[PDB]
Amino acid sequence: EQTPLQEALNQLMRQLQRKDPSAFFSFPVTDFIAPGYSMIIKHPMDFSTMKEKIKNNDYQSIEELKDNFKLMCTNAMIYNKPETIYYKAAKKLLHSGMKILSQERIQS
């Protein structure tokens, strides 16, 4: 029995992962795939961690999920140089994901 907020966050997640066809952001980045990663990135984030937070009722709002999504993409721009495939992928995903997540206030 999931809450309406959990349901809403799951639906946003399905849309966001469709914008990552290479699966670069599905799971945590290890020091084996990315030498020295843990030496540089001190606040890691990825889509599997976000899904576990949803399941554990660790989100209070869509805002919180959007900020963790931003943190995941910004981390790739700190660790990887601008010329690399991972920096370019992060920029593309940040922009398409924010088109999904951003919206106008809704007033009564």
Ligand X SMILES: COc1cc(-c2cn(C)c(=O)c3cnccc23)c(OC)cc1CN(C)C
For binding to Cl ion (CB under 5 A), which residues are involved? 27, 91
59 part of the interface to ligand X, by CB under 6 A: no
From the list 15-23, 30-38, 51-59, 60-68, the region that binds Mg ion by CB under 5 A is: 60-68
Q: What are phi and psi of 33, to 5 degrees?
A: -75, -25
| Distance in angstroms between the alpha carbons of the first and the last residue of the chain | 29
Which one of the spans 52-60, 63-71, 75-83, 95-103 is the region binding ligand X (CB under 6 A)? Answer: 75-83
Give the shortest CB-93-to-Zn ion separation in angstroms: 11
Residue 13, Cβ neighbours under 10 Å: how many?
16
**Which of 47, 54, 51 is closest to 97 using CA atoms?**
47
Please report the DSSP string for 15-53 in residue order.
HHHHT-TT-SSSSPPPTTTSTTHHHH-SS---HHHHHHH
- The residue sitting closest to Zn ion, measured at its beta carbon, is 67
Nearer to ligand X among residue 45 and residue 65 (C-beta)? 45
Q: Which residue is nearest to Mg ion (CB)?
A: 63
Residues that bind ligand X (CB under 6 A): 23-25, 27, 29, 33-34, 76, 79-80, 86
